[PDB]
């Protein structure tokens, strides 16, 4: 009922994020998204291309960010929401835009050169 994503049981840690902001301040949205369909017509995967902290806000700016992956939009599975659907949702510039970002515990894969010499 409440939650559910091909796995009700509990395994390994995880931190989910949810951002619910009203419209996008008129005009066009503030951030762009990527739609992958592999070799089909519907959606298969969504990724955050660009994101503006000014167009959005210092509140949802922490939750969302460029590089993450949108699991659900407005409270719906993108893995099922046809491309047009995944895009239309964004077009909505007069309604509460909900974005569910997934945050993993694992550390950020950075370089591999610490403080040399001792």
CATH number of the domain within which 90 lies? 2.30.42.10
Domain coverage including residue 16: 5-114
- The position carrying tokens 């939009």 is 73
Contact status, residue 70 vs residue 47, Cβ threshold 8 Å: yes
* Residue 46: strand, helix, or coil: strand
Give CA 49 to chain center in angstroms.
10
Tell me how many domains the chain contains.
1
In angstroms, the CA 114 to CA 118 distance is 10
Which stretch of DSSP H or E encloses residue 73? Answer: strand 70-73
Tokens of 42: 């519907």
Sorted by sequence, the CB contacts under 8 Å of residue 72 that are 6+ apart come out as: 78, 98, 100
In 10 A of CB 81, how many CB atoms? 20
């Amino acid at each position: 009922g409440s939650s559910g994503s091909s796995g009700v049981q509990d395994q390994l840690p995880y931190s989910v994020t949810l951002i619910s902001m009203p419209a996008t301040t008129e005009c066009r949205r503030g951030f762009s998204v990527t739609v992958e369909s592999a070799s089909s017509n519907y959606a298969t995967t969504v990724q955050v291309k660009e994101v503006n902290r000014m167009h959005i806000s210092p509140n949802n700016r922490n939750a969302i960010h460029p590089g993450d992956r949108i699991l659900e939009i407005n409270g719906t599975p993108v893995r099922t929401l046809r491309v047009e659907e995944v895009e239309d949702a964004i077009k909505q510039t007069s309604q509460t835009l909900q974005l569910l970002i997934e945050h993993d515990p694992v550390p950020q894969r950075l370089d591999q050169s610490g403080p040399s010499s001792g």
